[PDB]
Amino acid sequence: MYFFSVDPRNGASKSGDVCGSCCCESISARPGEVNGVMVSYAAWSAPLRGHGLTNKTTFEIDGVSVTPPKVSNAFGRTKVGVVFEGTLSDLFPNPEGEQVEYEISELNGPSNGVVELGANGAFTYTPGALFTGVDRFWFSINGNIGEYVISVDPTTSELPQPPFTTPVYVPAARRSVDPRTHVLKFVLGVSPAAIPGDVYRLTVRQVAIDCDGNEFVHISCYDISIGSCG
Amino acid sequence: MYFFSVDPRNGASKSGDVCGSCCCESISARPGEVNGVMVSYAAWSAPLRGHGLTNKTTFEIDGVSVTPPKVSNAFGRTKVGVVFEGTLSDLFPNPEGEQVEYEISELNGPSNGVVELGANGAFTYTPGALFTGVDRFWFSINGNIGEYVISVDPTTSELPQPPFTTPVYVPAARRSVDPRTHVLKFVLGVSPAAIPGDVYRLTVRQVAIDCDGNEFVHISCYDISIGSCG
Amino acid sequence: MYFFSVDPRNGAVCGSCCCESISARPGEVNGVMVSYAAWSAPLRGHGLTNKTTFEIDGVSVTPPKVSNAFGRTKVGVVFEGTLSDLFPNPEGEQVEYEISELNGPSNGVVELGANGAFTYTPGALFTGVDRFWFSINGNIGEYVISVDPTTSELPQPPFTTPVYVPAARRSVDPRTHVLKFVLGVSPAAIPGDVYRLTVRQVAIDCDGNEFVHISCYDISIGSCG
Amino acid sequence: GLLSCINMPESCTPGWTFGEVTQLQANGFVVSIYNDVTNYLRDEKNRP
């Protein structure tokens, strides 16, 4: 749980002690982790006598070092109860021609089914009985990690299609604000497909409120550095 | 007993990151030992005010230095009450048969039977009367150690298959998590067939829970060093 | 009484490889206590169990000069035997024999003749096994006699090894995690020899599972204390 | 550090040219002698 304090916007300076001004603060993350972040606006919203924070936080994720993925994630469809089959060879365009040591990490296995990796880039996904929804599982083609997402109808019509979760994401509805202590809490999810060394940026726009219901905006950054060993 | 304190995933680091870290904690093991490990998530899950951990831990054993074994393993079968006979010479593919000394170390002998070694790579296993299950014993051909399993059916048809225990393993169900003190306990068993000097890597993925039922994932690693006399 | 403490397995006397040290004099029968308190107390459970396993290996043996011999006499009847065909006396040497009174018979009396002859009169109304230890020109060996209860016979016991641990004299104290056992040294053990004893003790948790632990001690057969 | 027992035949074209020399040195190897380093170039995660 990262804990950050906001700059009070008091014409008070900061970030200068040591060379390389990186004002937007840093956050270390590991591929696969799911952490929690708390930011204390009490330094900025307490002098502004009013009704504290509101649930109007908005986020943006933009990467300054993406390191394009060697492989590409894939999608599939099947009905309920029926076994699903798939291949894992057309998802790795290789430049120089080498072997293919396929692997399914059991740390990142399926959630409502079982997977049988075949002899050569083939896999059998048997969904659990009496289950309909979406499922994901993360393969490692020659170390390069990708995901395969299976949709499982209740064998009647069809399903929509999920948005192929990004390397760095923020959950849709897991944010909270405590107006009694001026703290905003949210979750930071790191995909297992994130490549070590990459650097992303999260911009947070959070608004307070006065005694009459007007608005007072605040904007900040955080540089998420996806590294190994957390 | 090993006791490890997990990283907090908050700002600064811990445990000799002074000049970086081997990135995995260390676990010294001796072939044959079965020890216990406790990991304390109090540093990471306590600031996450919620319901502590859950019983959804998952493990992974990966060898970074294996030194593949010389003597292969074998599997036997017999009915209940009837004595079993077996050979011990075709399991040692060698460049010379110099002085092959078939030896059954008593420390890891049978469990519900008795074995009489022959003069030249033969052995007679008399299973215990009124007993049906799986029974193993560890032989040592010219220093090189292997195992022989003679699982016994009650003369109905057969037991399907034992899984041929690996050099290092974690038992199926002997783990527990105490949500009151944020401690996970699990046992670590290393077979007597592990070679001194080998290095394996065990990765642990443990998930906590917030007050409303969501998830916070955490991942750690540990390097198991198999050293004789330790 | 030897008293050792086990390492609690945290990666926290290596000597040569790991194993500890135990001096021993030929003929003695001593006692050893090893405290698993350091290793089994953090694993809060039901203490140890009575499932220890011992194994003896010799890393320095000095193969014996003299040899042993058996015997299957009957009850009450006198027994006669020789002691000349035991020592191969390779280089011409006096065959002077001797029966040490410290390690004489247990339920009889021997009569060492002039040239390796001996007459064993077993104790009246006695049926079982007996041993004694002779010293043919400094080198020590044993002679075992089985007195049979005149019905048919009596089985053959195993010639005792130089260093041994008695069959059933081990114990475990689960309230203090202490293992007690006995170390027996044959009078035929040659000084300077070095043997290795390995132990595999199993502790138990509150649910009935097992926790293994393995250790060694190097027994050095030394003369003069 | 000059190797005594070598007696290599002299020439004009040495071997690894300056660029290659830098490559070897920085990367590692102990191109001759000079630069008696041990090829490390990295660490657990951070290179320097």
XYZ file of C-alpha atoms in Angstrom:
733
model
C 0.000 0.000 0.000
C 1.736 3.118 -1.272
C 1.027 6.242 0.782
C 1.519 9.647 -0.838
C 1.112 13.211 0.411
C -0.090 15.988 -1.881
C 1.768 19.229 -2.448
C -0.284 21.929 -0.679
C -0.110 24.342 -3.657
C 1.139 27.079 -1.380
C 3.711 28.469 -3.671
C 5.783 26.054 -1.651
C 8.537 24.500 -3.693
C 9.732 20.917 -3.694
C 11.669 18.368 -5.743
C 15.085 19.968 -5.976
C 17.315 18.331 -3.374
C 18.967 16.021 -5.932
C 19.560 16.349 -9.704
C 16.954 15.073 -12.141
C 13.703 16.775 -11.178
C 11.097 14.005 -11.426
C 8.231 15.952 -9.789
C 5.559 13.373 -10.575
C 6.493 10.826 -7.891
C 7.679 7.266 -8.568
C 5.910 3.947 -7.945
C 7.647 0.568 -8.199
C 5.561 -2.361 -9.434
C 5.996 -6.037 -10.323
C 4.372 -7.937 -13.222
C 1.497 -9.822 -11.623
C 1.064 -7.763 -8.456
C -2.137 -5.995 -7.411
C -1.372 -3.198 -4.952
C -3.281 -0.432 -3.192
C -2.514 3.281 -3.223
C -3.632 5.947 -0.746
C -3.202 9.677 -1.378
C -3.786 12.166 1.453
C -5.255 15.448 0.188
C -5.393 16.822 3.748
C -2.405 19.045 2.965
C -4.427 20.826 0.248
C -8.146 20.465 1.044
C -8.054 21.159 4.792
C -7.146 24.877 4.544
C -9.976 25.157 2.017
C -12.766 25.029 4.614
C -15.596 23.131 2.936
C -17.118 19.665 2.537
C -13.914 17.776 1.773
C -13.442 15.467 -1.186
C -15.973 14.001 -3.614
C -16.241 10.774 -5.606
C -15.285 12.442 -8.890
C -11.778 11.112 -9.451
C -10.667 10.491 -13.030
C -7.567 8.637 -14.194
C -5.517 8.361 -17.372
C -2.848 5.791 -18.242
C -0.214 6.704 -20.824
C 3.118 4.963 -21.319
C 6.422 6.695 -21.982
C 8.180 3.376 -22.635
C 5.944 0.664 -24.057
C 8.479 -1.962 -25.277
C 6.188 -3.469 -27.951
C 5.166 -7.059 -27.152
C 6.966 -9.816 -29.035
C 3.686 -11.765 -29.091
C 0.023 -10.770 -29.308
C -2.911 -11.763 -27.115
C -5.783 -13.814 -28.505
C -9.510 -14.419 -28.093
C -11.794 -17.420 -28.486
C -15.413 -18.480 -28.171
C -17.274 -21.609 -27.088
C -20.568 -22.730 -25.582
C -21.160 -24.125 -22.095
C -20.384 -27.772 -21.382
C -18.629 -28.245 -24.726
C -14.864 -28.739 -24.689
C -12.777 -26.030 -26.364
C -9.675 -26.573 -28.492
C -7.100 -24.097 -29.725
C -3.649 -23.627 -31.186
C -0.763 -21.559 -29.850
C 1.515 -21.342 -32.899
C 0.014 -18.544 -35.026
C 0.327 -16.016 -32.175
C 4.150 -15.720 -32.254
C 5.528 -14.105 -35.403
C 9.232 -14.919 -35.019
C 11.890 -12.982 -37.045
C 14.842 -15.283 -36.763
C 13.627 -18.825 -36.750
C 13.847 -20.724 -33.490
C 12.207 -23.362 -31.316
C 8.934 -22.873 -29.449
C 9.010 -23.886 -25.755
C 5.347 -23.323 -24.953
C 4.395 -22.940 -21.295
C 1.273 -22.242 -19.237
C 2.215 -20.732 -15.885
C 0.103 -22.400 -13.206
C 0.394 -19.202 -11.166
C -1.655 -17.534 -13.923
C -3.835 -20.468 -14.939
C -7.545 -20.405 -15.761
C -10.233 -19.563 -13.209
C -13.262 -21.729 -14.081
C -11.747 -24.449 -16.229
C -8.782 -26.725 -16.850
C -6.092 -26.437 -19.521
C -4.136 -29.267 -21.161
C -1.102 -28.105 -23.140
C -0.582 -30.444 -26.093
C 2.622 -31.627 -27.742
C 3.093 -28.801 -30.282
C 1.352 -25.483 -29.637
C -2.058 -27.056 -29.037
C -4.220 -26.709 -25.952
C -7.521 -28.084 -24.665
C -9.647 -25.863 -22.418
C -12.391 -27.755 -20.606
C -14.724 -25.288 -18.842
C -16.068 -26.136 -15.419
C -19.563 -27.589 -15.349
C -22.428 -25.130 -14.790
C -20.475 -21.963 -15.540
C -20.973 -19.137 -18.036
C -18.888 -15.984 -18.320
C -15.348 -15.078 -19.365
C -12.048 -16.777 -18.568
C -8.404 -15.882 -19.146
C -5.109 -17.723 -19.084
C -1.571 -16.486 -19.661
C 0.846 -18.389 -21.894
C 4.620 -17.889 -22.182
C 5.847 -18.421 -25.753
C 9.660 -18.575 -25.428
C 9.456 -16.360 -22.349
C 7.361 -13.724 -24.109
C 4.073 -13.603 -22.216
C 0.644 -13.240 -23.786
C -2.929 -13.914 -22.743
C -5.740 -15.947 -24.276
C -9.303 -15.031 -23.296
C -12.155 -17.504 -23.817
C -15.818 -16.516 -23.846
C -18.247 -19.240 -22.751
C -21.886 -18.802 -23.728
C -24.695 -20.396 -21.709
C -25.105 -22.153 -25.081
C -27.996 -19.939 -26.147
C -27.157 -16.812 -28.154
C -23.649 -15.341 -27.887
C -21.454 -13.081 -25.750
C -19.751 -9.680 -26.118
C -15.965 -9.335 -26.166
C -13.636 -8.103 -23.386
C -11.173 -5.243 -23.911
C -7.924 -7.281 -23.693
C -6.691 -5.938 -20.348
C -3.725 -3.584 -20.627
C -0.313 -3.987 -18.955
C -1.148 -1.292 -16.379
C -4.769 -0.683 -15.424
C -6.936 0.793 -12.680
C -10.083 -1.134 -11.658
C -13.380 0.345 -12.810
C -15.076 0.670 -9.403
C -12.689 0.152 -6.495
C -12.011 3.810 -5.633
C -13.068 5.524 -2.422
C -12.714 8.903 -0.718
C -13.011 9.549 3.015
C -14.096 13.193 3.497
C -13.477 12.989 7.252
C -9.718 12.504 6.759
C -9.204 13.633 3.121
C -7.818 10.369 1.747
C -8.392 8.796 -1.672
C -7.848 5.041 -1.982
C -7.617 3.067 -5.212
C -6.112 -0.108 -6.636
C -3.210 -0.525 -9.059
C -3.301 -3.710 -11.137
C -0.226 -4.862 -13.053
C -0.753 -7.368 -15.848
C 1.510 -10.437 -15.975
C 2.265 -9.407 -19.575
C 4.040 -6.220 -18.488
C 7.648 -6.137 -19.683
C 10.290 -5.286 -17.049
C 11.955 -1.903 -17.391
C 8.960 -0.186 -18.979
C 7.716 3.141 -17.615
C 4.091 4.323 -17.624
C 2.425 7.475 -16.305
C -0.814 7.819 -14.339
C -2.477 11.234 -14.137
C -4.979 11.781 -11.322
C -7.563 14.577 -11.434
C -9.413 14.823 -8.115
C -11.905 17.551 -7.197
C -12.819 18.875 -3.755
C -15.939 20.891 -2.895
C -16.633 24.103 -1.001
C -19.393 24.831 1.514
C -21.811 25.868 -1.264
C -21.151 23.067 -3.761
C -18.603 24.604 -6.139
C -15.494 22.760 -7.330
C -11.742 22.942 -6.730
C -9.676 20.724 -9.021
C -6.260 19.167 -8.446
C -4.010 17.263 -10.863
C -0.957 15.088 -10.204
C 1.184 12.393 -11.827
C 2.833 9.156 -10.834
C 5.472 7.307 -12.863
C 4.893 3.564 -12.598
C 8.170 1.713 -13.203
C 7.440 -1.927 -14.033
C 10.462 -3.784 -12.710
C 11.348 -7.290 -11.561
C 11.689 -8.077 -7.851
C 9.000 -5.477 -7.229
C 11.709 -23.979 10.781
C 12.114 -21.118 8.316
C 10.428 -17.792 9.067
C 10.387 -15.054 6.422
C 9.023 -11.509 6.532
C 7.597 -10.379 3.197
C 8.415 -7.060 1.550
C 5.940 -4.228 2.221
C 5.703 -3.021 -1.413
C 5.729 0.528 0.001
C 8.357 3.112 -0.898
C 11.707 2.055 0.536
C 12.973 -1.516 0.557
C 14.263 -4.032 3.077
C 16.770 -6.854 3.680
C 20.097 -5.844 2.179
C 18.779 -4.157 -0.931
C 21.759 -1.996 0.020
C 23.571 -3.178 -3.047
C 20.503 -4.869 -4.455
C 19.265 -8.320 -3.531
C 19.782 -11.829 -4.821
C 16.057 -11.126 -5.439
C 15.095 -14.414 -3.817
C 15.275 -15.350 -0.163
C 17.355 -18.474 0.472
C 16.342 -21.903 1.743
C 19.005 -24.478 2.605
C 17.770 -28.061 2.335
C 19.192 -31.524 2.949
C 18.028 -34.540 0.890
C 15.351 -36.326 2.901
C 14.358 -33.505 5.248
C 10.779 -32.266 5.612
C 10.778 -28.805 7.180
C 8.225 -26.069 7.802
C 8.119 -22.530 6.443
C 6.148 -19.557 7.755
C 5.761 -16.297 5.829
C 4.455 -13.221 7.659
C 2.465 -10.794 5.502
C 2.057 -8.435 8.474
C 4.325 -5.931 6.731
C 2.124 -5.874 3.611
C -1.424 -6.845 4.624
C -1.742 -4.943 7.912
C -1.775 -1.460 6.304
C -4.424 -2.953 4.016
C -7.092 -2.756 6.720
C -9.422 -5.581 5.752
C -9.938 -9.288 6.346
C -6.323 -10.378 6.026
C -5.367 -13.306 3.847
C -7.368 -16.099 2.210
C -6.855 -19.792 1.459
C -6.025 -19.178 -2.203
C -2.251 -19.598 -2.310
C -0.539 -21.187 -5.318
C 3.008 -22.484 -5.709
C 5.456 -23.250 -8.506
C 8.656 -25.315 -8.494
C 11.253 -24.501 -11.149
C 14.808 -25.803 -11.316
C 17.625 -23.452 -12.284
C 20.319 -26.110 -11.735
C 19.268 -29.758 -11.853
C 22.226 -31.994 -12.825
C 19.944 -34.734 -14.231
C 20.144 -38.023 -12.335
C 22.222 -41.014 -13.357
C 20.006 -43.885 -12.178
C 16.457 -43.848 -13.507
C 13.390 -44.678 -11.438
C 11.036 -47.620 -11.888
C 7.511 -48.737 -11.038
C 6.215 -52.106 -9.866
C 2.873 -53.788 -9.258
C 1.581 -56.783 -7.308
C -1.587 -58.111 -5.703
C -2.249 -58.242 -1.958
C -0.606 -61.001 0.057
C 1.476 -62.207 -2.880
C 5.209 -61.536 -2.647
C 6.860 -59.294 -5.247
C 10.163 -59.952 -7.006
C 12.136 -57.365 -8.918
C 15.397 -56.451 -10.590
C 17.766 -53.561 -9.926
C 20.227 -53.821 -12.827
C 18.391 -52.320 -15.823
C 17.891 -48.979 -14.032
C 21.571 -47.928 -14.224
C 22.603 -47.148 -17.811
C 26.360 -47.011 -17.349
C 29.546 -46.862 -19.446
C 30.944 -49.720 -17.338
C 29.615 -52.258 -14.854
C 32.746 -51.806 -12.744
C 31.708 -52.766 -9.189
C 27.981 -51.947 -9.061
C 26.993 -52.240 -5.391
C 23.237 -52.500 -5.012
C 22.447 -50.978 -1.632
C 19.211 -50.282 0.246
C 19.751 -47.543 2.825
C 17.716 -48.414 5.910
C 16.916 -44.764 6.695
C 14.575 -44.593 3.681
C 13.505 -48.229 3.501
C 9.975 -49.541 3.005
C 6.974 -48.313 4.969
C 4.553 -51.267 5.198
C 6.722 -54.170 4.093
C 10.191 -55.693 4.089
C 12.831 -56.073 1.371
C 15.501 -58.769 0.997
C 18.179 -57.686 -1.461
C 19.608 -60.377 -3.709
C 23.239 -60.889 -4.598
C 23.159 -59.238 -8.053
C 20.530 -56.567 -8.666
C 17.595 -58.646 -7.443
C 15.242 -57.988 -4.556
C 12.249 -59.611 -2.873
C 9.591 -57.289 -1.432
C 7.181 -58.963 0.984
C 4.298 -56.522 1.554
C 2.751 -56.455 4.996
C -0.129 -58.856 5.489
C -3.578 -57.233 5.362
C -2.379 -54.072 3.637
C -3.115 -52.346 0.325
C -1.757 -49.023 -0.894
C 1.454 -47.391 -2.104
C 4.896 -48.298 -0.787
C 8.290 -46.969 -1.848
C 11.916 -47.635 -1.032
C 15.059 -45.764 -2.024
C 17.940 -47.775 -3.480
C 21.511 -46.622 -4.105
C 23.343 -48.079 -7.113
C 27.018 -47.056 -6.891
C 26.243 -43.956 -4.857
C 23.543 -42.829 -7.277
C 20.181 -42.825 -5.495
C 16.817 -43.713 -7.008
C 13.405 -44.869 -5.829
C 11.304 -47.970 -6.485
C 7.535 -47.932 -5.889
C 5.664 -51.238 -5.613
C 2.125 -49.945 -4.953
C -0.147 -52.858 -4.048
C -3.800 -53.216 -4.969
C -6.151 -55.366 -2.852
C -6.245 -57.721 -5.849
C -9.246 -55.883 -7.266
C -7.669 -54.558 -10.447
C -4.855 -52.036 -9.750
C -3.965 -48.625 -8.363
C -3.769 -46.180 -11.297
C -0.366 -44.516 -10.771
C 1.830 -42.844 -8.145
C 3.198 -39.496 -9.337
C 6.902 -40.384 -8.869
C 7.735 -37.734 -6.267
C 10.096 -35.019 -7.483
C 13.431 -34.136 -5.836
C 11.832 -31.060 -4.222
C 8.105 -30.717 -3.617
C 5.422 -29.047 -1.525
C 2.721 -31.417 -0.198
C -0.778 -31.036 -1.615
C -2.734 -29.937 1.474
C -0.708 -29.028 4.554
C -0.852 -25.217 4.241
C -2.829 -22.744 6.323
C -3.347 -19.000 6.705
C -4.199 -17.199 9.937
C -6.194 -14.037 9.092
C -5.751 -12.848 12.687
C -1.952 -12.501 12.530
C -1.313 -12.612 8.748
C 0.881 -15.717 8.649
C 0.955 -18.468 6.020
C 2.345 -21.882 6.967
C 3.414 -24.514 4.456
C 5.654 -27.567 4.599
C 8.654 -28.217 2.354
C 9.649 -31.816 1.620
C 12.772 -32.677 -0.372
C 13.244 -36.241 -1.593
C 16.454 -38.140 -0.759
C 17.131 -38.251 -4.523
C 18.119 -34.578 -4.727
C 21.719 -33.991 -5.806
C 23.910 -31.787 -3.576
C 24.585 -28.484 -5.301
C 21.301 -28.216 -7.198
C 19.271 -25.002 -7.125
C 15.491 -24.778 -7.499
C 13.168 -21.769 -7.403
C 9.809 -21.786 -5.613
C 7.465 -18.883 -6.372
C 4.499 -18.123 -4.111
C 1.418 -16.162 -5.213
C -0.676 -15.169 -2.188
C -3.906 -13.158 -2.372
C -5.334 -11.022 0.429
C -8.849 -9.559 0.618
C -10.302 -6.151 1.409
C -13.334 -5.473 3.588
C -15.726 -5.927 0.639
C -14.347 -9.089 -0.977
C -11.933 -7.826 -3.636
C -8.376 -9.063 -4.158
C -4.788 -7.925 -3.644
C -2.214 -10.259 -5.185
C 1.405 -10.572 -4.048
C 4.231 -12.640 -5.547
C 7.507 -13.770 -3.971
C 10.344 -16.168 -4.795
C 12.740 -18.376 -2.846
C 15.865 -20.205 -4.016
C 16.142 -23.725 -2.601
C 19.770 -24.866 -2.338
C 20.176 -28.623 -1.902
C 23.323 -29.117 0.175
C 24.342 -32.384 1.753
C 25.182 -32.161 5.451
C 22.688 -29.422 6.246
C 26.563 -38.783 29.246
C 26.891 -36.944 25.939
C 24.557 -33.993 25.410
C 24.086 -32.481 21.954
C 21.829 -29.752 20.587
C 20.307 -29.932 17.115
C 20.364 -27.049 14.654
C 16.843 -25.585 14.278
C 17.106 -25.490 10.456
C 17.225 -21.756 9.759
C 20.346 -21.635 7.602
C 21.800 -19.695 10.498
C 30.610 -27.339 14.177
C 30.723 -28.154 10.476
C 34.028 -29.947 11.077
C 34.576 -31.787 7.800
C 31.087 -32.051 6.307
C 28.439 -31.589 8.992
C 28.603 -34.376 11.464
C 29.400 -33.918 15.163
C 32.085 -35.657 17.242
C 31.920 -38.415 19.884
C 34.981 -39.970 21.503
C 34.739 -43.560 22.717
C 36.926 -46.149 24.514
C 36.791 -49.866 23.601
C 34.473 -51.812 25.899
C 32.455 -48.922 27.321
C 28.678 -48.556 27.084
C 27.765 -44.879 27.373
C 24.617 -42.797 26.993
C 23.790 -39.891 24.697
C 21.007 -37.297 24.883
C 20.155 -35.057 21.936
C 17.810 -32.104 22.438
C 15.456 -31.426 19.529
C 14.010 -28.589 21.622
C 15.584 -26.030 19.295
C 14.036 -27.614 16.181
C 10.624 -28.937 17.261
C 9.454 -26.220 19.674
C 8.683 -23.546 17.021
C 6.697 -26.219 15.182
C 3.994 -26.228 17.861
C 2.610 -29.761 17.816
C 2.703 -33.079 19.675
C 6.472 -33.247 20.127
C 8.559 -36.121 18.855
C 7.662 -39.754 18.216
C 9.334 -43.099 18.892
C 10.337 -43.647 15.258
C 14.071 -43.003 15.272
C 16.352 -44.874 12.885
C 20.082 -45.409 13.388
C 22.741 -46.405 10.857
C 26.447 -47.087 11.392
C 29.106 -46.584 8.721
C 32.870 -46.883 9.066
C 35.161 -44.346 7.432
C 38.216 -45.932 9.085
C 38.002 -49.612 9.994
C 41.489 -51.208 10.106
C 40.257 -54.711 9.121
C 40.519 -57.114 12.063
C 43.468 -59.474 12.400
C 41.944 -62.291 14.468
C 38.581 -63.833 13.554
C 35.536 -64.937 15.536
C 33.937 -68.350 16.047
C 30.573 -69.835 17.018
C 29.440 -72.684 19.281
C 26.316 -74.816 19.807
C 26.821 -76.955 22.917
C 24.085 -78.383 25.142
C 22.960 -77.738 28.717
C 25.050 -79.054 31.589
C 27.527 -80.729 29.244
C 31.080 -79.408 29.162
C 32.392 -77.852 25.947
C 35.888 -78.067 24.475
C 37.427 -75.751 21.921
C 40.630 -74.590 20.288
C 42.075 -71.121 19.775
C 44.907 -71.857 17.319
C 43.063 -71.867 13.973
C 41.771 -68.319 14.572
C 44.904 -66.170 14.346
C 46.510 -66.719 10.905
C 49.878 -65.565 12.456
C 51.265 -64.617 9.016
C 54.850 -63.863 10.043
C 56.416 -66.282 12.527
C 55.318 -65.050 15.948
C 54.547 -66.503 19.371
C 50.889 -67.499 19.608
C 50.613 -66.460 23.277
C 46.900 -66.403 24.117
C 44.998 -64.722 26.943
C 41.456 -64.509 28.326
C 40.873 -61.080 29.856
C 39.065 -61.313 33.187
C 37.248 -58.049 32.435
C 35.403 -59.640 29.500
C 35.158 -63.263 30.588
C 32.082 -65.471 30.271
C 28.695 -64.560 31.749
C 27.262 -67.867 33.024
C 30.278 -70.161 32.968
C 34.035 -70.491 33.387
C 36.761 -71.151 30.827
C 40.013 -73.106 31.290
C 42.727 -71.764 28.993
C 44.960 -74.713 28.141
C 48.648 -74.551 27.361
C 48.271 -74.227 23.556
C 45.104 -72.373 22.563
C 42.818 -74.927 24.196
C 39.906 -73.937 26.391
C 37.226 -75.816 28.318
C 33.916 -73.995 28.799
C 31.750 -75.364 31.603
C 28.338 -73.675 31.301
C 26.467 -72.810 34.469
C 24.196 -75.604 35.655
C 20.513 -75.020 34.868
C 21.130 -72.422 32.166
C 20.113 -72.287 28.498
C 20.929 -69.408 26.171
C 23.831 -67.470 24.652
C 27.208 -66.494 26.086
C 30.289 -64.660 24.844
C 33.863 -64.030 25.862
C 36.736 -61.945 24.526
C 40.205 -63.366 23.916
C 43.425 -61.515 23.061
C 45.728 -63.497 20.773
C 49.039 -61.614 21.032
C 47.498 -58.188 21.565
C 44.773 -58.522 18.916
C 41.310 -59.040 20.392
C 38.502 -61.259 19.119
C 35.337 -62.844 20.477
C 34.078 -66.402 20.895
C 30.327 -67.012 21.170
C 28.767 -70.178 22.598
C 25.105 -71.193 22.401
C 24.004 -73.574 25.159
C 20.897 -75.469 24.014
C 18.106 -76.780 26.262
C 18.761 -80.411 25.216
C 15.622 -80.495 23.029
C 17.000 -79.784 19.568
C 19.071 -76.624 19.106
C 19.227 -72.809 19.396
C 19.382 -70.145 16.638
C 22.498 -68.228 15.622
C 22.883 -64.658 16.910
C 24.835 -62.023 14.967
C 28.455 -61.354 15.904
C 28.389 -57.947 17.573
C 29.793 -55.064 15.537
C 32.607 -52.865 16.939
C 30.296 -49.869 17.421
C 26.576 -50.431 17.902
C 23.391 -48.931 19.309
C 21.289 -51.352 21.395
C 18.087 -52.724 19.896
C 15.522 -51.282 22.340
C 17.004 -48.722 24.721
C 15.922 -45.483 22.985
C 13.364 -43.059 24.364
C 11.789 -39.696 23.569
C 10.428 -37.069 25.978
C 7.736 -35.080 24.110
C 7.412 -32.646 27.028
C 11.055 -31.569 26.602
C 11.961 -32.817 23.083
C 14.870 -34.987 24.221
C 16.002 -38.251 22.630
C 17.933 -40.683 24.837
C 19.915 -43.588 23.428
C 22.899 -45.798 24.198
C 26.286 -46.179 22.487
C 27.894 -49.600 22.876
C 31.509 -50.183 21.859
C 32.854 -53.689 21.394
C 36.163 -54.509 23.121
C 37.362 -55.623 19.667
C 37.230 -52.055 18.338
C 40.737 -51.087 17.236
C 41.927 -47.673 18.481
C 42.183 -45.038 15.782
C 39.135 -46.289 13.891
C 36.403 -43.793 13.007
C 32.748 -44.678 12.419
C 29.749 -42.555 11.452
C 26.290 -42.748 13.026
C 23.365 -41.173 11.194
C 20.000 -40.470 12.802
C 16.621 -39.687 11.191
C 14.167 -38.374 13.780
C 10.537 -37.580 12.954
C 8.461 -34.958 14.765
C 4.676 -34.662 14.400
C 2.191 -31.799 14.111
C -1.222 -31.495 15.748
C -2.863 -33.282 12.781
C -0.701 -36.411 12.545
C 1.722 -35.450 9.768
C 5.513 -35.784 9.886
C 8.638 -33.617 9.990
C 11.928 -35.351 9.177
C 15.390 -34.417 10.448
C 18.763 -36.030 9.702
C 22.108 -35.681 11.507
C 25.418 -37.492 12.050
C 28.040 -38.030 14.698
C 31.574 -39.318 14.099
C 32.533 -41.854 16.757
C 36.303 -41.958 17.257
C 37.444 -45.153 18.973
C 40.340 -43.860 21.071
C 42.468 -45.739 23.583
C 43.345 -44.561 27.098
C 40.169 -42.581 27.732
C 51.497 -7.882 -16.615
C 53.478 -8.331 -19.832
C 53.340 -12.041 -20.664
C 56.907 -13.314 -20.699
C 56.524 -16.654 -22.493
C 54.672 -15.544 -25.625
C 57.152 -14.302 -28.255
C 54.473 -13.519 -30.839
C 55.623 -12.475 -34.331
C 55.400 -8.717 -34.756
C 53.277 -7.146 -37.477
C 51.424 -3.931 -38.297
C 47.779 -4.986 -38.376
C 47.285 -5.768 -34.665
C 43.933 -7.467 -34.326
C 40.821 -5.984 -32.744
C 40.768 -2.421 -34.049
C 40.136 0.488 -31.649
C 36.357 0.143 -31.945
C 36.506 -3.586 -31.291
C 38.882 -2.855 -28.397
C 36.284 -0.575 -26.809
C 33.563 -3.164 -27.469
C 35.560 -5.926 -25.753
C 36.731 -3.756 -22.835
C 33.332 -2.243 -22.006
C 31.509 -5.528 -22.534
C 33.918 -7.666 -20.662
C 36.890 -9.533 -22.072
C 40.529 -8.898 -21.172
C 41.898 -8.109 -24.655
C 45.705 -7.943 -24.630
C 47.902 -7.174 -21.550
C 45.487 -4.415 -20.571
C 42.284 -4.007 -18.594
C 42.432 -7.013 -16.234
C 38.720 -6.769 -15.428
C 36.246 -9.634 -15.053
C 33.305 -9.523 -17.450
C 30.393 -8.399 -15.295
C 28.571 -5.564 -17.127
C 25.408 -6.166 -15.108
C 23.890 -7.272 -11.814
C 20.710 -8.867 -10.498
C 18.439 -6.212 -12.069
C 20.276 -2.882 -12.472
C 23.201 -3.006 -14.899
C 25.766 -0.562 -13.385
